[PDB]
Amino acid sequence: LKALAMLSSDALSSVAYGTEQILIILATISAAAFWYSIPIAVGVLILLLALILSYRQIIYAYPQGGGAYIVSKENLGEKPGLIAGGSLLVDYILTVAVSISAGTDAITSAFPALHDYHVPIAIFLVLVIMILNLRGLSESASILAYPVYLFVVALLVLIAVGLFKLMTGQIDQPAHHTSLGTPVAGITLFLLLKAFSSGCSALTGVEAISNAIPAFKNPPARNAARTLAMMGILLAILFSGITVLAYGYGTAPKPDETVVSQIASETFGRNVFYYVIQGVTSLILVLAANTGFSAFPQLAFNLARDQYMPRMFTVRGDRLGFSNGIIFLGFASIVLIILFGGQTEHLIPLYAVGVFIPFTLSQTGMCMKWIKQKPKGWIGKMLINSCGALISFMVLSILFVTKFNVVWPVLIFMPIVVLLFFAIKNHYTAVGEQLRIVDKEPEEIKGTVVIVPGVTTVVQKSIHYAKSLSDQVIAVHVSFDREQEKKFEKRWEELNNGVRLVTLHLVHPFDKFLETVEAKAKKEQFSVMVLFPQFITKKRWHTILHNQSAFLLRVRLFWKKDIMVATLPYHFK
Template identity: 35%
Template sequence: MAGFAAKCAGSPPPGRPFLGSSVRLGSADRWERVLGEERDAAGRDRPVISLSPSAEFPPLSAQDVEALHRLGEHWRAADEVRALPVDPELRPARPGATHTRAPDEEFRPDQPGELTATPTAELPDTLLGRVAVRARRVLLGRPLSSKAILRERMRKIVALPVLASDLLSSVAYGPEALLTVLVLAGSATLGLSLPIAAALVVLMLAVGASYRQTVRAYPHGAGSYLVASASLGPRTGLTAAAGLILDYVLTVSVSVAAGIAAIASALPAAAPLSVPLSLAVIGALLAGNLRGIRVAGNIFAAPTYLFLVAVGGMTLVGLAQAAARGFAVVPPPHVPATEALSVLLIARAFASGATSMTGIEAVSNAVPAFRPTEWRNARTVLTWMVSLLIFLFAGLMVLIHLNGLVPRADETLLSQLAHRTFPEGPWYAIVQAATALVLLLAANTAYNDLPRLLYFMARDGYVPRRFLHMGDRLALSNGLVALSVSAAVILTAFGGRTQSLIPLFAVGVFLAFTLSQVGMVNHWRRQRGSGWRRRAAVNAFGAALSSIVLVSAAVTKFVEGAWVVVVAVPTLVLTCLGIRRHYDRVRQALSLRPARPPSPDRARELAQEFLPQRVRHMFVVPVARFDKAALRALTYVVSLGQPSLAVHVSPEDQEADRLREEWTAWGDHIRLETVVSPHREILEPLAQYIAQLYDRSPGITLTVVVPEVVVERPWQRILHSQIERRLRRSLRRLPGVVITSMPKHLSEARARTAR
């Protein structure tokens, strides 16, 4: 018992070593815990969260280990020590062995009873498979060892462009979204843009300060999903997660569409190709992120810094030019009003301008991706991000107002401002190129955060567990692919139009903001540590402002497309709850201990169910014709010394009679049962016959051994019936029926013929 518990914990057991050996695929020397507990400043437990390739298979609980120990006691009477016909440690083979590779090329001895697979062992056997693996390695790089995850962390100088690209690039379309709504009341109302911008700056400060506290309170992961789940309950956490999922998918769609729009402003000929170009950019982003977080950070850092220099420099030059003329305001061109100025219109403009804050939560989601000390470095980067955002947003809004610019269908506001600031020289082209690049790569923030969110949700059982899997480069590949496909579908459906996507954008963003900050208020109220009232007040202020934007966006943009998010969020929550219920049922069904303590009789019955000596076998061999494939399966079955039966399904009596005659000539060593199918159906009568056998004696384990012809080329498979797979689909509902196959290789037969 102690030995097994030690093995589960990852340390060698005391006393005698374990019998048997384990093979691991490059496992790490040590791991951070996937989910543990640590004490916070107030002495309370809080979760410790990090990524691990082993997250799908956590260690057994102490109760499960105890149940396993009790079950193992019943096995002792059935234990038989038998010599293995092959050395499991793969020591050098005897001379003349057919294995062509030296064992240490595939598996390297690590310690007694344990081998480590080398890259050679991970290559497929087929030529096509090996070509695919090598092509993937050329595209993505050589696979990283699992222990390299501890080194895949970001420095602050790399984390800033990786995590801030979405936030900072949003100033390229946020101000334009604000003015596009405001100008509906005519150019005379554009003066309201500065008060609205000032209110948005206050919102940025409040939300930024709130997330700084969130990062400190949850130093091992502070996304809205985790905070809301811990403080407000799992359903609220799922609501926040649904908003984040929509946020990240739309981040990719909006950023890429805005980047292509920036290119089209400078090169109008590219406008008709906006959707294909957008899809190509999404493909490039996917390939870059599949290479790993550190490599992706190094690739995508330069464009963000170029954008900061270009747009920041344009802002400073523009302010200097405005100061030289005494900050005189250039009158905007006349735009007729199509709507009356109202509180509702102002609220719509405020909600649209608030999209300049998208991505502000990226740092809190990615705290574990920083180098130690994680939370301190994350807060530093968050402070830089918010400061840069306020400078760029406020500066651009002031310059747009001073220059009298209005939104135009053929050119973005940023392009107009660059033309006005740099009427000659290469600077306009530099600003447009930097803007296009950062908009295209702003989606990288979503590529960094959404797979991590799906990982945590999969760990909790709310999304498929495949999102726990890491690829060759320790990237959460399934999450990256799901994000790319979803964004590509949405972008194509909306024809690459940024303004059509933004109404969907704001609701999901601020839903997550609001729930995260409300969760933080509840967090401080529960802890009641030093200064908790001040911290709770900061988060409450941020929650109040975020909720105002949320309600404004949902109400004012409902008809424009926000209804999609209003419908999608509860749909996603219900879907996640359904997935969780399924996993709960699976876990209960597979658990080593029942949900409730069983009665003594039931406990003995459960123990008997898993005793090897209590298993009753019967083997069934479907025989289509008497040939080498069938004979090989029959030979295998007879060698096991268990009750056996052969079954032949025939479309007519004459064929059945012919096979019985051949069977008698062979010697009738196994009972043969023939089934005549007058309507020429073969599979269904065979499946029904096997099901009837099982129903007559449900206590037996019925193993169906299907003779299988293994062809030499993949295309040749379509020339054969693949009855094993079809039979497995038909009989999978029966718990005591096992479907397997006995292969007969054509390449083996040809080699013998050649000799």
């Protein structure tokens, strides 16, 4: 069909948290008489129109379509362009944190008795999304694509009946502010732009369609651009309908419920249809967290090349770093939920800074790319991108110069990631310049000893493979607290074996024996090799509790020694 839902779930889920909650909280904490919801909503829609035309330009200029990092690096260089990668990391961590925190704030308003603990509902929803991305690995075409349609039709029919109730001359909240003009004391243009900055976080979703272009099965232009156009107009009318209903009634920002909850409550009764609205909004915020997890590894893959991430992300979702990426994203999301509670009123400036550093850098890089050449309608596209850069930059600077008590994790976390990316690049240059040389051949050692550490079928199998693979093999076993080691040697010899054994009488005597046999290795020009066994079950749960003592301990011991180890599996059946 179409399948725009895996990206529209990140886009149009912001009609619940960063729209009326944060904006109306700032307007009430000024003077408790708000009427600037409609002009700031129109200003946010104007900034949305600027961003959707700028990303139409970026998609029409890149059919490859990797947005917000590749353009920044290739049109800014190295020291910038990489900060776009760091801020997309902060945006991914915070989109799963903020989407889950607003999901719990919209699920502890249908059943408000469990609002005492709602930090450990957030960690539970992060954990079930992390599990269903790890072991389930669904990525299906029904569960990820039906609730966005249900949400759009649900909020549409709610906006229809709510504007119908606000119409036909009926008052449904007799307390109501003015309509036109009537300024209120204690309100500056600085505070109005403060509310415009904090309420600008409704449009943090178009980055998802600019960062997840491929698998369209058509020409890339004129199709994904029109998908982005439909998503932009749907977010526009949805956010405008929710803010015109919240200005329509009283709708104070109560510190236990959201704004869409109060809209549904005073619109269509307490509990008849209201439960499907809170249900579908919790589901949509959960799917937005899933889109954050799903769009992590494309950034990780675009940064693994050019030697900035660990190298393991080069396979693009063939399960190497997808596990480590999912675990890191979940752990940083959980520690941010813990540091900020299940609040979704403090994390919104963090998430907006994390999404409006990449918009700024992407627009500046597109501006420099359009100032490099003058091909086709030059000054118009240049002014569109530069004005978008200006308005995103003033949004970032307003969100940074205040709320500085919450955005200290960005100022800490960004130079750590930039310094680490520089260190990984320097390390891979040093490895590529020290390694990849032309040398000679070694001694051609022509002789190898095989060491193996009760008389057991696995022990006799491993010592048979030892005698097959080499000669002069040595069996050892650690002996303590009794006299049975002489009895063990006795029953060994007169039961099965005739091979050589040199027992001992824990780590320290073992590394002493290995150091002595390494002393009998260098001038003798003969190498050394230790063979281990491994017990392998069938039920896949007994990976623990069988071999993870000797294996882990002696593999930890077997560094700085230059002795090759080997494992032989038994595979219990």
